[PDB]
């Protein structure tokens, strides 16, 4: 969160929170309701984002569903959509947090080691999350999908 980050940064320098830092927390806590609506919309539209994003993923990338592929079968495809559901939930956490700290610590720290331990191509993961970014930007406003879409952009930048 922004509170946690300000605290941590301040803690490193062993000093009280700076006026500039303090001003941001005011802007954050007053921008609250707008964000709740943003995570409310991505919360209540999750099934279309995960299914439609999964469809654009597998249609763009037939290699994963090819015989001998990681995503082959019904069970494995269900596990693949399960993970896209995870990262959509984490993005909503990052939106209400006003920072990627929740997303980064739940989802991104050590992700490459896990998917390399699973045999999963992580570029396919990033293509899946980019597909959900396109669907989720189709569900939102201009400035709103700018913001939420940039949280998706951070997860894409963590995968690549």
């Amino acid at each position: 969160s922004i509170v946690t980050k300000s605290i941590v940064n301040a803690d490193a320098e062993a000093r009280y929170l700076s006026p500039g830092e303090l001003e941001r927390i005011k802007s954050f806590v007053l921008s609250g309701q707008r964000r709740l609506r943003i995570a409310q919309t991505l919360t209540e539209n999750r099934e279309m984002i995960v299914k439609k994003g999964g469809q654009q993923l597998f249609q763009k990338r037939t290699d994963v569903v090819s015989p001998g592929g990681n995503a082959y079968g019904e069970e494995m495809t269900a596990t693949c959509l399960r993970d896209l559901d995870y990262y959509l939930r984490l993005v909503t956490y990052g939106i209400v947090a006003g920072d990627v700290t929740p997303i980064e610590e739940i989802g991104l720290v050590g992700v490459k080691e896990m998917y390399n331990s699973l045999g999963t191509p992580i570029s396919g993961v990033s293509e899946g999350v980019r597909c959900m970014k396109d669907v989720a930007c189709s569900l939102l406003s201009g400035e709103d999908s700018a913001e939420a879409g940039f949280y998706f952009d951070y997860t894409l930048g963590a995968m690549q």
């Binding site: 969160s1 509170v3 946690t4 605290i7 941590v8 301040a10 803690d11 009280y16 929170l17 006026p19 303090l22 927390i25 005011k26 954050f28 806590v29 007053l30 609250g32 309701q33 709740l36 995570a39 409310q40 919360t43 999750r46 939930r89 909503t92 956490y93 209400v96 947090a97 006003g98 700290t101 929740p102 739940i106």
Partner: protein
């Protein structure tokens, strides 16, 4: 560490659920109290030196501690206690402004009772000093924010004791 927001995402995350209306009520509670926390942190940042001066003047001076043989008797040890008090005030402000005392669990109260029982710092007098900072600080920030700072100073005092 964690703030109140991170704690909500911890409970909602560890259930596997998304954000339901209860967690959004908790986020609304924090976002209502936000500005109050901000100005309280501003004022404490402003008058930390004054607060330390008044709480040491109330709680510690002209006693056996600053008389020779007490633990504050030298200039190095006077400085050490004064410096120590500053840390309690600073991390109590962090705990106030996060809305969650996890910081005091991580960076303050860990090993502190073993430190003071190792050196020979009186725990009693320290607790009295922290409560003096609680009263002065509550006098500066007012009623509401003084209750909030009161829970974190009392958290550190419950940690030492």
């Amino acid at each position: 560490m964690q703030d109140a927001i991170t704690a909500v995402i911890n409970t909602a995350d560890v259930q596997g659920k998304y954000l339901d209306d209860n967690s959004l009520d908790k986020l609304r509670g924090y976002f209502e109290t936000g500005e109050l926390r901000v100005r309280a942190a501003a004022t404490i940042a402003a008058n930390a030196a004054t607060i330390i001066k008044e709480s040491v003047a109330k709680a510690l001076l002209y006693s056996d501690i600053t008389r020779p043989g007490g633990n504050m008797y030298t200039t190095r040890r006077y400085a050490a206690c004064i410096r120590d008090l500053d840390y309690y005030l600073r991390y109590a402000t962090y705990g106030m402004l996060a809305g969650d005392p996890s910081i005091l669990d991580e960076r303050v109260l860990n090993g502190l009772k073993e430190t003071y029982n190792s050196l020979g710092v009186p725990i009693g007098a320290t607790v009295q000093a922290i409560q003096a900072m609680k009263e002065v600080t509550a006098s500066l920030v007012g009623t509401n924010a003084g209750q909030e700072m009161a829970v974190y100073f009392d958290y550190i005092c419950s940690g030492l004791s």
